[PDB]
Amino acid sequence: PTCDEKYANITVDYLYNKETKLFTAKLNVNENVECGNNTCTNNEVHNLTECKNASVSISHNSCTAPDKTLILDVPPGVEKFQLHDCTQVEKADTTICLKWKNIETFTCDTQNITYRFQCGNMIFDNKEIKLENLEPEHEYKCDSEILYNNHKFTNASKIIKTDFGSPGEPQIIFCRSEAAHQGVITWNPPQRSFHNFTLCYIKETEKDCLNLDKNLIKYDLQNLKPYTKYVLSLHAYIIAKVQRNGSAAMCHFTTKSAPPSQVWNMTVSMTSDNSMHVKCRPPRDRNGPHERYHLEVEAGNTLVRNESHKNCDFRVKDLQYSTDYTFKAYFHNGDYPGEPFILHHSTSGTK
Ligand SMILES: *[C@@H]1O[C@H](CO)[C@@H](O)[C@H](O)[C@H]1NC(C)=O
Ligand SMILES: *[C@@H]1O[C@H](CO)[C@@H](O)[C@H](O)[C@H]1NC(C)=O
Ligand SMILES: *[C@@H]1O[C@H](CO)[C@@H](O)[C@H](O)[C@H]1NC(C)=O
Ligand SMILES: *[C@@H]1O[C@H](CO)[C@@H](O)[C@H](O)[C@H]1NC(C)=O
Ligand SMILES: *[C@@H]1O[C@H](CO)[C@@H](O)[C@H](O)[C@H]1NC(C)=O
């Protein structure tokens, strides 16, 4: 057939010379072809400017006239594109973002420029791509190429590593309280890589948190309130490109009861010449399960009266006249009594 017939579907490969900033067009043909005015030694058209059309008329002894007129639509310079890692730092442990950047202008129409990627075995067609649900602490090879009129003119590879993902959780051997103001937590460290621990103890109203060293596996909880339930939470964390907290292990205990605080604002007031009215306010810290107010009346370093009520209101009647009395009032929570509030008041009249 005609050379236009034999070479109607001829393909070209573009080879960039970084030193000259010029392209070579390699004609994809077996036989040593002849080119018109312009020479094509071997089967290569040399020194082509980027983004400029060149015409080549192709013939061979095996085909007749007309010659195959081939238009070389030369691509942009390879150094005008850069493969950039756009990965979001908060999601670096499970994601990859890659994007080609156009670092210098070129006159070629961008509508004929296509970008391809292969990450693992997934194939993408776009200027930028995103991979999600990646396993942390792994390495992946993402290959990419750029096409002009579906012809590859450049390519690159990017090897990416995924950051440090979620450690924890630690295992509690036991968390208990053997005292009223103290508690303890015994645990085992998690198998994953971590930087430190976080302990939080929650009571009814307050929540207190602490950062402990990664080396210790026991914590002595000090300065606790008697007869109160504490919900402990222990988790491990790591400082990667962002802080990553692991799962939290939970445990609880109620601290032991203790003697209550002293009763508040105790008063003794005369109701007659031989009778007193004793009243006080509840202790700030009851520290126990039940409620009871006790009154001890002493005279001459000897206990003369011992009364108890649900409320701190005592009417001490029919006492001896002209006698100095000691009034010891205290709360009893059911488990322990409180330190007595001591007041002295003497009776009037004469015996
Ligand atoms: C293009 O891909 C080939 C493998 O297909 C590779 O050998 C070559 O180095 C890549 N080019 C660049 C500049 O990364
Ligand atoms: C744990 O936290 C403290 C601050 O609370 C910090 O000074 C210390 O360096 C951390 N430990 C480790 C091993 O990173
Ligand atoms: C991670 O733990 C720290 C305390 O170590 C806390 O301030 C932060 O809010 C926690 N974040 C999450 C998402 O659990
Ligand atoms: C005790 O009660 C009296 C009378 O109500 C009051 O003036 C005083 O401020 C109270 N003291 C305390 C410590 O609450
Ligand atoms: C007063 O009675 C209480 C309640 O039974 C008792 O615990 C306490 O010992 C008595 N006081 C004295 C000084 O005996």
Side-chain angles (χ1 to χ4, degrees):
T2 79
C3 296
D4 183 29
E5 214 143 308
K6 195 183 187 184
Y7 305 112
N9 333 64
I10 195 173
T11 65
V12 161
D13 286 320
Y14 286 105
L15 301 96
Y16 198 67
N17 183 328
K18 310 201 130 207
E19 236 206 334
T20 60
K21 284 189 182 186
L22 299 161
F23 277 100
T24 289
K26 176 192 169 214
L27 312 170
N28 305 133
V29 283
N30 287 295
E31 60 269 52
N32 213 219
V33 115
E34 260 263 81
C35 303
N37 287 352
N38 330 263
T39 318
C40 58
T41 47
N42 197 50
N43 285 349
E44 295 179 356
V45 183
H46 295 289
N47 296 350
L48 302 166
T49 303
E50 68 187 302
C51 293
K52 291 201 183 171
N53 283 3
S55 54
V56 74
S57 234
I58 297 156
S59 187
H60 193 255
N61 54 260
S62 297
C63 55
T64 75
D67 275 27
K68 165 66 188 162
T69 288
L70 177 65
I71 305 300
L72 307 172
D73 193 353
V74 182
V78 161
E79 302 181 280
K80 291 183 169 195
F81 306 105
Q82 208 54 58
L83 185 54
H84 168 86
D85 183 350
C86 40
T87 307
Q88 42 190 351
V89 304
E90 6 42 279
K91 286 201 162 167
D93 64 324
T94 68
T95 339
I96 289 171
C97 179
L98 299 187
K99 180 214 286 168
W100 280 99
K101 288 256 155 103
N102 184 21
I103 63 147
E104 264 177 50
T105 61
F106 51 82
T107 61
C108 293
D109 197 322
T110 45
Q111 83 172 297
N112 327 99
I113 297 196
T114 56
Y115 307 86
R116 287 193 53 247
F117 291 84
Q118 192 181 340
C119 290
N121 297 322
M122 303 283 239
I123 297 155
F124 302 97
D125 176 347
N126 201 59
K127 194 164 188 139
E128 134 192 20
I129 67 151
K130 289 184 181 186
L131 284 94
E132 292 159 45
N133 294 127
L134 292 173
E135 243 176 283
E137 299 280 279
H138 287 282
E139 191 171 277
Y140 303 102
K141 328 197 166 232
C142 285
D143 298 309
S144 190
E145 71 179 7
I146 318 175
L147 319 181
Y148 180 64
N149 302 325
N150 290 6
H151 277 252
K152 179 201 85 59
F153 67 99
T154 191
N155 67 284
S157 268
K158 267 250 197 272
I159 291 158
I160 317 274
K161 280 214 67 197
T162 51
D163 204 14
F164 312 94
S166 304
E169 66 149 67
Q171 171 209 238
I172 308 141
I173 313 293
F174 45 81
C175 72
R176 53 154 187 256
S177 177
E178 288 145 276
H181 307 86
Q182 283 158 111
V184 81
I185 333 105
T186 312
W187 69 90
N188 286 155
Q191 293 286 95
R192 251 162 289 188
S193 302
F194 62 96
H195 279 172
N196 258 353
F197 291 106
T198 309
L199 183 79
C200 296
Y201 56 104
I202 308 111
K203 67 182 183 173
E204 250 201 78
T205 45
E206 238 185 49
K207 170 194 168 166
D208 300 292
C209 287
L210 277 150
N211 284 320
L212 318 174
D213 208 282
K214 67 174 273 178
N215 295 294
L216 56 113
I217 58 148
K218 187 200 183 189
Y219 191 82
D220 295 289
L221 288 153
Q222 317 255 106
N223 310 299
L224 302 165
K225 183 161 197 173
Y227 202 67
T228 54
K229 185 173 167 170
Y230 289 98
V231 174
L232 275 297
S233 160
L234 183 84
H235 75 89
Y237 70 91
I238 190 148
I239 306 108
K241 287 177 164 189
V242 111
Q243 203 193 318
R244 311 242 152 85
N245 303 341
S247 180
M250 307 234 169
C251 83
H252 72 284
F253 60 77
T254 178
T255 183
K256 302 285 174 148
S257 61
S261 76
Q262 287 192 282
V263 293
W264 194 260
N265 214 344
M266 193 199 164
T267 58
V268 193
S269 63
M270 297 227 238
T271 46
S272 81
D273 280 47
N274 68 0
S275 67
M276 313 292 313
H277 191 216
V278 178
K279 59 173 82 167
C280 85
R281 284 286 283 191
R284 322 288 90 186
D285 306 25
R286 288 160 224 261
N287 296 323
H290 310 307
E291 281 207 34
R292 200 79 186 164
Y293 296 89
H294 287 273
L295 182 74
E296 288 176 7
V297 178
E298 299 177 334
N301 323 299
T302 304
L303 193 91
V304 291
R305 276 152 212 247
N306 197 3
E307 302 290 310
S308 76
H309 289 320
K310 57 189 187 166
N311 300 306
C312 198
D313 184 85
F314 302 89
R315 294 201 100 102
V316 197
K317 298 163 181 176
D318 311 291
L319 297 152
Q320 290 184 89
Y321 303 100
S322 267
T323 307
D324 316 312
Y325 282 102
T326 304
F327 301 89
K328 297 161 97 183
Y330 61 98
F331 183 88
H332 194 101
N333 61 25
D335 300 333
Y336 297 90
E339 252 306 277
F341 195 133
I342 299 137
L343 288 182
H344 297 83
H345 205 294
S346 74
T347 56
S348 293
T350 38
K351 269 144 162 172

PDB file of all heavy atoms in Angstrom, residues 198 211 235 237 243 245, ligand 3:
ATOM      1  N   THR A 198      -1.954   8.077  81.299  1.00  0.00           N
ATOM      2  CA  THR A 198      -2.877   9.080  81.828  1.00  0.00           C
ATOM      3  C   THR A 198      -3.864   8.385  82.764  1.00  0.00           C
ATOM      4  O   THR A 198      -4.604   7.490  82.343  1.00  0.00           O
ATOM      5  CB  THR A 198      -3.574   9.878  80.713  1.00  0.00           C
ATOM      6  OG1 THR A 198      -2.590  10.385  79.812  1.00  0.00           O
ATOM      7  CG2 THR A 198      -4.397  11.041  81.256  1.00  0.00           C
ATOM      8  N   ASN A 211      -0.656  12.850  84.489  1.00  0.00           N
ATOM      9  CA  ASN A 211       0.241  12.260  83.506  1.00  0.00           C
ATOM     10  C   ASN A 211       1.373  11.559  84.249  1.00  0.00           C
ATOM     11  O   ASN A 211       2.139  12.200  84.973  1.00  0.00           O
ATOM     12  CB  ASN A 211       0.758  13.299  82.509  1.00  0.00           C
ATOM     13  CG  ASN A 211      -0.260  13.704  81.470  1.00  0.00           C
ATOM     14  OD1 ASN A 211      -1.026  12.883  80.946  1.00  0.00           O
ATOM     15  ND2 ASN A 211      -0.270  14.984  81.127  1.00  0.00           N
ATOM     16  N   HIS A 235      -5.222   4.993  80.532  1.00  0.00           N
ATOM     17  CA  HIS A 235      -4.921   4.830  79.121  1.00  0.00           C
ATOM     18  C   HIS A 235      -3.503   5.300  78.832  1.00  0.00           C
ATOM     19  O   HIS A 235      -2.956   6.131  79.561  1.00  0.00           O
ATOM     20  CB  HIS A 235      -5.955   5.541  78.217  1.00  0.00           C
ATOM     21  CG  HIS A 235      -5.846   7.038  78.132  1.00  0.00           C
ATOM     22  ND1 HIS A 235      -5.042   7.656  77.185  1.00  0.00           N
ATOM     23  CD2 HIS A 235      -6.514   7.993  78.816  1.00  0.00           C
ATOM     24  CE1 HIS A 235      -5.213   8.958  77.355  1.00  0.00           C
ATOM     25  NE2 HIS A 235      -6.090   9.210  78.323  1.00  0.00           N
ATOM     26  N   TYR A 237      -0.685   6.825  75.850  1.00  0.00           N
ATOM     27  CA  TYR A 237      -0.654   7.690  74.673  1.00  0.00           C
ATOM     28  C   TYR A 237       0.764   7.778  74.088  1.00  0.00           C
ATOM     29  O   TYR A 237       1.730   7.386  74.744  1.00  0.00           O
ATOM     30  CB  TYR A 237      -1.214   9.089  74.992  1.00  0.00           C
ATOM     31  CG  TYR A 237      -0.357   9.949  75.900  1.00  0.00           C
ATOM     32  CD1 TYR A 237       0.593  10.818  75.376  1.00  0.00           C
ATOM     33  CD2 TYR A 237      -0.554   9.955  77.276  1.00  0.00           C
ATOM     34  CE1 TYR A 237       1.363  11.632  76.204  1.00  0.00           C
ATOM     35  CE2 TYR A 237       0.202  10.773  78.112  1.00  0.00           C
ATOM     36  CZ  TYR A 237       1.158  11.613  77.570  1.00  0.00           C
ATOM     37  OH  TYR A 237       1.920  12.413  78.388  1.00  0.00           O
ATOM     38  N   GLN A 243      -0.903  13.746  68.875  1.00  0.00           N
ATOM     39  CA  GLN A 243      -1.057  12.860  70.037  1.00  0.00           C
ATOM     40  C   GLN A 243      -2.077  11.770  69.733  1.00  0.00           C
ATOM     41  O   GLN A 243      -3.172  12.078  69.263  1.00  0.00           O
ATOM     42  CB  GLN A 243      -1.476  13.649  71.289  1.00  0.00           C
ATOM     43  CG  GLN A 243      -1.119  12.931  72.598  1.00  0.00           C
ATOM     44  CD  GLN A 243      -1.784  13.512  73.827  1.00  0.00           C
ATOM     45  OE1 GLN A 243      -1.875  14.733  74.008  1.00  0.00           O
ATOM     46  NE2 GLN A 243      -2.222  12.644  74.726  1.00  0.00           N
ATOM     47  N   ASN A 245      -4.123   8.708  71.596  1.00  0.00           N
ATOM     48  CA  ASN A 245      -4.485   7.994  72.828  1.00  0.00           C
ATOM     49  C   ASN A 245      -5.038   6.616  72.534  1.00  0.00           C
ATOM     50  O   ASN A 245      -5.879   6.460  71.643  1.00  0.00           O
ATOM     51  CB  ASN A 245      -5.521   8.752  73.661  1.00  0.00           C
ATOM     52  CG  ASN A 245      -5.167  10.148  74.078  1.00  0.00           C
ATOM     53  OD1 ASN A 245      -3.996  10.568  74.086  1.00  0.00           O
ATOM     54  ND2 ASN A 245      -6.218  10.872  74.450  1.00  0.00           N
TER      55      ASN A 245
HETATM   56  C1  LIG B   3      -6.122  12.233  74.884  1.00  0.00           C
HETATM   57  O1  LIG B   3      -5.624  12.226  76.225  1.00  0.00           O
HETATM   58  C2  LIG B   3      -5.347  13.536  76.749  1.00  0.00           C
HETATM   59  C3  LIG B   3      -4.797  13.335  78.143  1.00  0.00           C
HETATM   60  O2  LIG B   3      -3.614  12.546  78.129  1.00  0.00           O
HETATM   61  C4  LIG B   3      -6.614  14.391  76.712  1.00  0.00           C
HETATM   62  O3  LIG B   3      -6.287  15.735  77.046  1.00  0.00           O
HETATM   63  C5  LIG B   3      -7.250  14.355  75.324  1.00  0.00           C
HETATM   64  O4  LIG B   3      -8.479  15.072  75.332  1.00  0.00           O
HETATM   65  C6  LIG B   3      -7.491  12.911  74.881  1.00  0.00           C
HETATM   66  N1  LIG B   3      -8.129  12.873  73.573  1.00  0.00           N
HETATM   67  C7  LIG B   3      -8.947  11.884  73.166  1.00  0.00           C
HETATM   68  C8  LIG B   3      -9.517  12.035  71.787  1.00  0.00           C
HETATM   69  O5  LIG B   3      -9.207  10.912  73.872  1.00  0.00           O
END
